[PDB]
Amino acid sequence: FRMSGGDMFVEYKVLSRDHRRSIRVEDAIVDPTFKRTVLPLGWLELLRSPSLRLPTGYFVEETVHVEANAIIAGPVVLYITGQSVPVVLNPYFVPEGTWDMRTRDGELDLRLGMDAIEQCTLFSELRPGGLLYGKLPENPNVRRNESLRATLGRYGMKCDLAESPLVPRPWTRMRYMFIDELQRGPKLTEFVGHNPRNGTPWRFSQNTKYFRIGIWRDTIRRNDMNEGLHAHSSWQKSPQQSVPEVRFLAPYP
Amino acid sequence: ANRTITGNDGRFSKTIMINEPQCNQALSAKTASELSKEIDKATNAVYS
Amino acid sequence: MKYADLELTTRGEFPHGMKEPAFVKKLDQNIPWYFSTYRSMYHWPITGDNWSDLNEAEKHHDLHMFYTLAWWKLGEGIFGVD
Amino acid sequence: EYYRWFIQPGRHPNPSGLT
Amino acid sequence: WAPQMEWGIENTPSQEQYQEHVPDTTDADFRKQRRIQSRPVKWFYESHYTRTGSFAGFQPLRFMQRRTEREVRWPDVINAAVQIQKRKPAAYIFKAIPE
Amino acid sequence: DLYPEGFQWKHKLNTEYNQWRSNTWLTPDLIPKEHRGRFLCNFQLNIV
Amino acid sequence: GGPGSPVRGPRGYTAEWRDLRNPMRPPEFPTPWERKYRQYARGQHPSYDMVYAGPMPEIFPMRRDFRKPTRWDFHDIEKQGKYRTSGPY
Amino acid sequence: AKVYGAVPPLGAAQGHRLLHGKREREGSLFAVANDVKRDERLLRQQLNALLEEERMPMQARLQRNEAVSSHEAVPQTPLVDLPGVERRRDLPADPITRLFFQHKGDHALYYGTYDKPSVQDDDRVQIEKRVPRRREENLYTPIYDFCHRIREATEQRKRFVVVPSTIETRGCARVMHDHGLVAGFRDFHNDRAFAVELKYFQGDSTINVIEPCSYDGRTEFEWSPKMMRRLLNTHGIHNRLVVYICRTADNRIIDHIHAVKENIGGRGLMMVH
Amino acid sequence: MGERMRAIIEDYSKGFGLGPHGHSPTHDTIHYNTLNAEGERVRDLGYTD
Amino acid sequence: MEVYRRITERVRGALWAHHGRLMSERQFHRILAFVYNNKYEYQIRFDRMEVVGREWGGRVEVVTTPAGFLKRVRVNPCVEDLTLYQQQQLILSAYANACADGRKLMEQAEMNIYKQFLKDLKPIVMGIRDNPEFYTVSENSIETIGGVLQTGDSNNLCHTHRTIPAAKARQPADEVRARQEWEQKWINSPRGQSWALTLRGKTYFALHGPQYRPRGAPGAKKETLPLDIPAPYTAMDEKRLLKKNWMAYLDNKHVAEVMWTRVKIADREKRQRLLQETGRAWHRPINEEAINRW
Amino acid sequence: WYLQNILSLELLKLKSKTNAEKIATYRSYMRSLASGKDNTMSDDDVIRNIIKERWKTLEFGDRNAGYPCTFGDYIQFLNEWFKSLDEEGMQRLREHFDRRIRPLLAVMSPVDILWLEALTQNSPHNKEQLQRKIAFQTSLGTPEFFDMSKRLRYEINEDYKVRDELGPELFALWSKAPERWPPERLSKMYGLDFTLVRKILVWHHFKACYDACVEPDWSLPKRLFALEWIRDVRARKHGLFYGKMRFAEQKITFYSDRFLFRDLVNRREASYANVWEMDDPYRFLQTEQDYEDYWGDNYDV
Amino acid sequence: CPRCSLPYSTTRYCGEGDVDTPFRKHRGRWAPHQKWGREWYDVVARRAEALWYRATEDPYFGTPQHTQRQAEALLKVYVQAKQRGKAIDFMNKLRGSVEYLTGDITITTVMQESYDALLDTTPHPHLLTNGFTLESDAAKYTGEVNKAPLSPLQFRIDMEMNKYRRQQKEEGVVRVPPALWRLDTSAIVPYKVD
Amino acid sequence: KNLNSWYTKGTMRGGVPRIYYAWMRPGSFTRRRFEKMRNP
Amino acid sequence: REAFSNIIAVDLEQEGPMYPVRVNADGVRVLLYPARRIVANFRVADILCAFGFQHAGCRINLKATNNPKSPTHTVEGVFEAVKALRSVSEIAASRGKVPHSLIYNIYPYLEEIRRRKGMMAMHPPGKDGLLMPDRVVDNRLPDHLKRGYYDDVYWKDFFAGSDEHLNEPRMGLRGDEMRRRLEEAQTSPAPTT
Amino acid sequence: YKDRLLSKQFFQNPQAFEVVPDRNERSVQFGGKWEYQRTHGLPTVDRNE
Ligand SMILES: [Zn+2]
């Protein structure tokens, strides 16, 4: 990813589906005008990896005219250095007869296609104000001459980010972050039922018929230990009631 | 494998003993390689 | 914002959930083994990505939160500088 | 359904329900 | 993605759930703990890949279990946990119309 | 972790914690001396 | 294919000695093998076993699960009768 | 726009069958059938080889890697060395403070057998073999008495135990030492017995219980691989806590973990955990 | 309350660094100011210019 | 790393001991993280470059990176006539020479890193040592309940130093503003315009010209006065911890005390080793009157 | 009432400090001398306390009486505002709820029933009786101890406070280039365990994205817990369950304490061309099974 | 009925007269007709969103790129279900879509006018639109029987006041504009009703 | 393939609540004694 | 009180035994074994549920008819069986082997070992990180210089009322500042003297 | 960089750039349910600089 001469130079590596065979290109021109990427035909057998899932090297292997002058073979994985998400492609393999890709001493003139660009974060550069927006092909829905500010004003933009007092500040969307280990410790998690991920953490309230007698006995004799099922309820004579999402390892209370 | 390096391991302490009384505790090439492997394995053990 | 002068004579009771129940001296069913031996069908939490035509958990949580904040007066004035 | 917002919960004017 | 698990609250019918008949209504079902259940087609709106199948290789403990024995011998009223039923009324109702 | 830490907070006394989040505090005479201000959970009594 | 299956059976240099070559010497065919796979195929790549993974922490709090209504939670005990209620649900 | 890992960017002579798109030429129906059969056979062989390479164990992989790394273009011949640098060195021992003398291996002729031991370690008492006195009494076995002696020493909090020396007992002791249930063991080359040093932890003993599989030598129990895997499967959770000893048809005393790993079933000896 | 206050006071009042013997004040083997030896030294020396 | 962690722990311990101030643990680890990221960026720069090792004259050539990643090997055909072991040893020796060159370059760059780290840490040390309430005592001085006694130990040879002037209000900010005034005077001087038109002036304005950098360019847009954070006059974390909860304050105080004790022990043992190397200290304790008489 | 009390700060008139008070506060605020008085509070704290008192003093009742607004008007305004709230406002409201009320819901006790009622009570004489009894209880004990707000005072891990964590570390520097900043660099800032620092990094990235008003990378937690995600997927495959594996459902196996030597030598003698190859986030994936277990979540890949 | 798609006039229970009704089991109870509301509008909106996602997720019937027919159908769904902010966000994302950049999908004037009509009819969160109507009994609270219950110039004044309050809260102080600063209210058009 | 399902385990005791640990014991959740160097 | 004196606890990380444990308190043979669910008599099952076990099975004296049979025996046998249970971590420690479930703790160590390649392994060539205080420095100043030292860079009277910073705490103070302190100290015991 | 960031922010929340905002909800996305994979992140400057 660098800008020089008005186009994007990106370095990447193309690898087989099983990631056994890999060829890395140091520079490739990000060209949105091409529908899909084009690769030399010689790389077909250097990227054909006959794995177990695919008995042949490529799931799809057909012939196309771009007369049957190119081979569509794939899928083939692609890792862009500046991108954190791999992109899988079915590129065109072209013989030397139809098109010679070599231009200079060791330069193959490989240009990345629109299908590869739209699947990575570089698609955002196709939006107005992006680097590829000026090299987008002519279309009635896009005018490259006009400025980004003009386009956004046409779309509806009036002021900058949250200049008006009505719209809240973008940085006020999250004023706090909930990390259990950094405050109040972990959670006291319980369940009633078969499995912890099957039942519910809500203990039955004080209104249950099996608990009312025990609760009344506790209210009368609060200074002793009364036997019964009332201890399973969310009502406890101790101030700390047993309720879901209670921090029990917290220093206070 | 040649029963030249011996090891006794407790819960936390590991003792490695060289046993070559026939050659006055002289190490050959293979014996030295095995001893180095045992040393850098016992030193790099978790509970050592 | 639509408004009309109205008076709610009885607001209600706080939905805290910890309220003293009406006490009974005699239980209708004297067997305590039923509570311990009761079984019910499994409650599977998530089935098929949890998609519904109307959001159940989110809408129920929002509706609960509305009246919880109403009874807690938006949780402002309770807290202070620590 | 709007009667519950103007009544005393303890007070039941006619538990019998017969006029 | 979690597949549609068998022997659930909604999957199982009334007799398999509690050995009693409950009305099968799409709304106002307090027993099933739901408010309104408008029913579209099960896998029409949902994505196909979210449907990963179903699982039924277990025992419904409420319905059928191994070694169904009485929990406690005395009193004789109590029985195995698989049977949870309410008291039967006496002289329910009579119908004058022959039908 | 054969011997873990537990609850090493002195922001409240042991008796204060027992009172706040334990049933055992309401029955001082029943609890022995060694477990006086230790428990932090409610207990249920079952008379066999 | 286990041990219960019937057995498979069993001066100079043999015929299979000629094809074997030292990896120090350049390969006969320069197939562009990935370096990571090259390390992994000979058992030298650092193994990231699943056991090295610890707990999967809950990044964001899911939600608050409010007490949903049930047959055992009613203000009046009149509706909890042996002729009507057999369980919470 | 340079590339790496491929010296030729593309092959001028190397094309593609589909790219050529020539008219299909078939010799005959028999030729077509033969081609189909040979290509499917090649595909099956490739798939089988790939599966075998996937299933190849780590030991085999490392050995093959080392062999190819050390491979030489010429099959080098072995050289003459000193009279001996390959003898199995005798394990160390203290002649003064010893349970038994560590008899060196050069006296294999002098060594006897368990039933008829030779005269050695006369300074110590000799362990007499257990023998039934009547028909009703159970036929005791060396494994049984070894297990019971170890258990009694553990219960009485002892350090060293003198136990009968057989191949199966030595294998069991080796497996226990490997699993850490026993601090150590030593097979002094005495025909009757060898020594085992026990281990304790937190005052108690690291060995909870030891039980021989069969009380009588007349009865012999065989362990199937499924019966062994049922031990590992603990209500759906893998479990290697309790240790079971089995002797296979190859005279190799192993544990149930390795027996399950290699899918073999031998006769059981004892359960220890 | 007494135990908590005593623990807090001791924790706040404990010293650190290196003393005249070059060891930590709470060293396992050696000690400092045995039987108020430093106390009697200060008593018999004082601060008088 | 190790040395940087030792330096930071010593800084924290001295800061707590001399002035009774507490440094946040986040602030403590931030410096180490900055050092680690600086080393990471140096490695990023180094992996691009390449080093050459040569063995047996020019028969064996090894092309690697300073980190030690094998990239290329060139071997004269006569070397293949040697046996495999000799070839392996020759390749190993060439790679060792390449590693030696990479080690030289990396240690020079890491000395640069260490100087940068010391420059970054300078304000803290200067603020904890350049205040009118800061003093130390000789290590060989007897310490008692009241105060420290002073042994002779050639008191004529001994001389107490002072790093602060008694003149009113002397600060690095004053020094830097004096430097700025001097450079502005030189620029405005009649020779200043000629020097600025000279290449030397161009280079000086290109390097130390932050106010001339256009908006959106990396680097500072101005030259600012150095940090002035005196320990006895600035509250760092102790007041916040004490206001929030006492237990955390006590824990951080204990950590600072332990770190100070540890660095003092390290200094004592280094001095002991220096004495033993010189020959003034015996290999085993012979004078128990300096230890057991307290 | 809300506009004229909580809002409209232009007419707020707090006490004007004298010249000596101004001098002393300037000294204390600019440079703190030891053993100074900590009772003094900032004007921001004073304003916040004023707003809190204004909220607390609000009491509903007859509009013609001393009470400013009635419960009917309060609930009408609240209901209309809740209906008018959109998704963004609902998200902020949920955040506020979880911040403020949810811990109070967790820690509330039946002893505070009268206080909870007095929060929005209709002012009977029973509330006055309960307040007098609460005053008696306070005389028995401690007022600041026996109140809801001060229940949540102390928290663990005081060194790394969420107030400091709200501002991302080197945010712009790593935002310019995400490839050059693997999680190890950022985690070197903190001195906690691996899981805690990775959680902190995820939270910081999400906070930065929310502040910049851009789509946050929802796959970032996956890339940070790539080993954990694979482990959970394979645990769900082995044990016929869906969720997150816990300790009680983990295999029991005892390895030798030196079992790690085989991997340790590989890690210690591994060499890389660049550093991005060394710390690529996909080094955990080797086979197609690993790739499937990793990328089986999203359908696009 | 949004649940059963039966007319209210002729039927009162959902699923009457339909053979494959899922709302009537063997021993179930008839479900009363549901009345339209924002809950059912949002239900329809969520169904439309799921359909839109499946339109590209489905490998059998789905298309690699969305269709302008699908886009206009979704816009029709939004306008007929009266989802104002949802339709606005959908239009913005349509403008930001990659296919819109390539020009395969074009925004037609029928869609534009439908969006405008929806915006005018649906009420505004802050201001008032064509959908709002003058009311009679609101004079009890307003005082004017004819004028609309919102002053645009007063709203502008309150907006400036709130902006200054926000600035004060952000900075801690306020910067006073010069004495020559005059507030501009030339373009404030009063609410004109029909 | 371990047909015993981890999802379906245990018995529903009616309304008897039991705790289940998330990852480890709460006693060993915090290690201040070593993190803050409180050990002897 | 006796129960609270003899109270015990178990390690719940496993939620049930991982090996069959067989004991006998007063002749009643009690066997506790791993199981999918809590399968046991009602009383012992409730005891296990109180203990928190979720995957366990307890059996006493095989069939219930077998003697001895009494509630005291039933309680004490199961309590003895639960007391005689060894946790997995304790068993691993006794064997001196690392548990499978705890080796994730070594992952940061291995990661740092692997990432110590290259520049991270470098050290300052010439500095060992330990510095000895060869010379003694003091910055103490007399009170008169302390009063006027910080007139320019800091505010006037920087050392105004500091007790620890100044030899004379009240030096450089003004009348109001002195009077506040003196008035407080003298009016606290107003009627005493 | 400024205009790239402005474009991203506008396509995220177009309501924030209005003097009087309208209702803001979330609609469908043209890049499937994982459009964040292509729309996430702040604008990126070139690695050479
Ligand atoms: Zn209907």
GROMACS .gro file of N, CA and C and ligand atoms in nm, chain L residues 1-8 11-15 23 31-35, ligand 1:
model
   58
 1556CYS      N    1  -5.562  -0.826   0.867
 1556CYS     CA    2  -5.484  -0.853   0.987
 1556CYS      C    3  -5.338  -0.877   0.950
 1557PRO      N    4  -5.243  -0.811   1.017
 1557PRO     CA    5  -5.102  -0.835   0.984
 1557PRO      C    6  -5.055  -0.976   1.014
 1558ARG      N    7  -5.127  -1.050   1.099
 1558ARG     CA    8  -5.087  -1.185   1.136
 1558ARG      C    9  -5.143  -1.290   1.040
 1559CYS      N   10  -5.270  -1.277   1.001
 1559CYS     CA   11  -5.336  -1.379   0.920
 1559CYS      C   12  -5.374  -1.332   0.781
 1560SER      N   13  -5.361  -1.202   0.751
 1560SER     CA   14  -5.396  -1.146   0.620
 1560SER      C   15  -5.541  -1.175   0.583
 1561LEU      N   16  -5.630  -1.161   0.681
 1561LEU     CA   17  -5.774  -1.174   0.661
 1561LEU      C   18  -5.842  -1.039   0.685
 1562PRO      N   19  -5.947  -1.008   0.609
 1562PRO     CA   20  -6.017  -0.881   0.631
 1562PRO      C   21  -6.085  -0.879   0.767
 1563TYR      N   22  -6.088  -0.761   0.828
 1563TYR     CA   23  -6.152  -0.747   0.958
 1563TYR      C   24  -6.304  -0.753   0.948
 1566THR      N   25  -6.421  -1.151   0.887
 1566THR     CA   26  -6.370  -1.249   0.982
 1566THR      C   27  -6.324  -1.178   1.108
 1567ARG      N   28  -6.338  -1.248   1.221
 1567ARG     CA   29  -6.295  -1.197   1.350
 1567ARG      C   30  -6.184  -1.278   1.414
 1568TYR      N   31  -6.166  -1.404   1.375
 1568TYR     CA   32  -6.062  -1.491   1.429
 1568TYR      C   33  -5.959  -1.519   1.321
 1569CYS      N   34  -5.832  -1.517   1.360
 1569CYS     CA   35  -5.725  -1.538   1.264
 1569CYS      C   36  -5.725  -1.682   1.214
 1570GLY      N   37  -5.706  -1.699   1.084
 1570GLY     CA   38  -5.700  -1.830   1.023
 1570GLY      C   39  -5.832  -1.892   0.985
 1578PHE      N   40  -5.220  -2.113   1.300
 1578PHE     CA   41  -5.271  -2.052   1.422
 1578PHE      C   42  -5.385  -2.131   1.485
 1586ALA      N   43  -5.759  -1.738   1.749
 1586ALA     CA   44  -5.684  -1.618   1.786
 1586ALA      C   45  -5.750  -1.496   1.726
 1587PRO      N   46  -5.780  -1.394   1.806
 1587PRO     CA   47  -5.845  -1.274   1.751
 1587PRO      C   48  -5.754  -1.197   1.657
 1588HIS      N   49  -5.817  -1.138   1.555
 1588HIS     CA   50  -5.755  -1.046   1.461
 1588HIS      C   51  -5.667  -0.945   1.532
 1589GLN      N   52  -5.546  -0.926   1.482
 1589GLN     CA   53  -5.452  -0.829   1.536
 1589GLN      C   54  -5.466  -0.697   1.463
 1590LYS      N   55  -5.461  -0.588   1.538
 1590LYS     CA   56  -5.471  -0.455   1.481
 1590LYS      C   57  -5.334  -0.402   1.443
 2032ZN      ZN   58  -5.619  -1.185   1.233
   0.00000   0.00000   0.00000
